[model samples]
Structures are given as structure tokens and as C-alpha cells.
Target: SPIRRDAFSIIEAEEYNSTNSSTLQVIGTPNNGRGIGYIENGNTVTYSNIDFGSGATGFSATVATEVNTSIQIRSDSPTGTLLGTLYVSSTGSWNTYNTVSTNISKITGVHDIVLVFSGPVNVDNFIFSRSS
Candidate 1:
């Protein structure tokens, strides 16, 4: 089964996909919107039990980085396979955002989709779009 990209509650947050309190936080801005801030170098957020059903081609994320960071999309867990990696460059502003995406290997069934941050960056939100 495929899902619409707009269905995600894409927003800036502590982990961009969680409501749990953290040393990280979500701030307000617009133009597209806010950002995920108070970031530590290596943070991982997992969206557990997502039913990709059929499979996916790639994914996209709205992000900003203070330094060069590579965002990796993993399956099953934080240490999951690198389905794809999106290199995020320093956009110069925390509130400034850019959407980055890449072609991933085929991902199917129910699994944990994990976003692993390699360096300091704020991920506003991401959408899992299947390859057409």
C-alpha cells in the first residue's frame, strides 16, 4: 500500500517525529515553518511499525544544518540498513529550510523507519514517498 506524502504531521520538533520531552526542542517560524533545534551531534528518531506494504523508492526531508551532515534512512531500527543517505549542507540559518531527497532501495512490509543524523542539523519533517 502507498501513502500520501501530505499525510504526515510534518513539523519542527525535538525529534521531528515525537512528542516526548528532550534536551532538544521545537521552535516557531514560518515559510514553510519552524525547525528542530537545541541539537546534539548524533540523534536518532525512529518511526516504528510503519507499513510500507508494497515498498518505497525514496524519501524526502525538509532540513537545515549548521555544519555538513548526512541524514540516513534506516529500516527496523536506528542501526538499520542505509536505504539512502541525503547530504545536508549548512543552509546558514536555523530557521532556513531546504528539502532534500534521494532514491532508496526497495522497502516493504511493516518496519521501523529511522532517521539517523550524522552531525548538527534540524529536521523539520519528512515524507515517505513511494517511487512511481
Candidate 2:
């Protein structure tokens, strides 16, 4: 097999290295999954040692919620540099999942990713894209 590349990666929400006030739950059928839920204002999930290789141009996420909400992408600490913000609105049902994407500021090397939430939302996974 060829050498593995770290340029593209998927950071599962349930696999966060650190977090504040979030809970893990099993997702329903049709799509076997597990993710973080019960997120309220200021809840955060942090993933460590994420490699961006040369750089990452964009990011995406799978999420579900009942009302309009947002997730802020931060680098390093919780109050670190602002990478981008992903806005997630209601996806019809609590078990219904939807994919949302946003173009972020080009980031390189290895760093921590902190996801700061703005209220009641369920997160499944995050994707980093290096597409040109």
C-alpha cells in the first residue's frame, strides 16, 4: 500500500481530546453513528494534534439541532485565533443529520482545534479539506 497521508482528516465529535459540558449519545438507525449532544451556550470540544500538512482550505461538519445555532472554529486554546464559523440550523428532527461546510483561513502544521458552540446542537464529525 502507499504511504498514508495526513493532509485530509475527519475528527469525530465523540472523540474529542477535551471538552466542557457536552455529552455523548448513540444516534438512530439508517445511519449508524454516535456523537456529542446536549450542547448549550459556550460548550466546547477540543481535538489535539491535528495535522494540516501544508494547509487546509476548508472545513465541514455533520450536525443536527432544533433551533438556529453556530459553532466557532478556534485554533490552539478556546480563545485562540478564529479560523471560521459554521452555522448549523435545525435539521427537521433531532435524529436527522445534515452536512454543513465553510471555507476557513488557510492553516498549516499541527495544532489544536477547539469547537465553541452557541447553543443546543448535536455534532457528529468534522472534515478538513485541502481541495484547491
Each model's Cα RMSD: 4.4, 3.9
Best by lDDT: 2
Error of 2 at 109 (Å): 0.3
lDDT of 1 at 15: 38
Assess candidate 2 and give its lDDT.
Answer: 0.80
Best by TM-score: 2
* Candidate 1 residue spans exceeding 4 A from truth: 1-22, 31-35
**Model 1: per-residue Cα lDDT at residue 54:** 73
Candidate 1 Cα deviation (angstroms), residue 9: 8.2
> Considering only N, C-alpha and C atoms within 3 Å, which residue pairs clash in candidate 1?
none
Q: For residues 23-55, write the lDDT of model 1, one tens digit per residue.
A: 566665566465566656567766656666676
* Per-model TM-score on C-alpha atoms: 0.76, 0.87
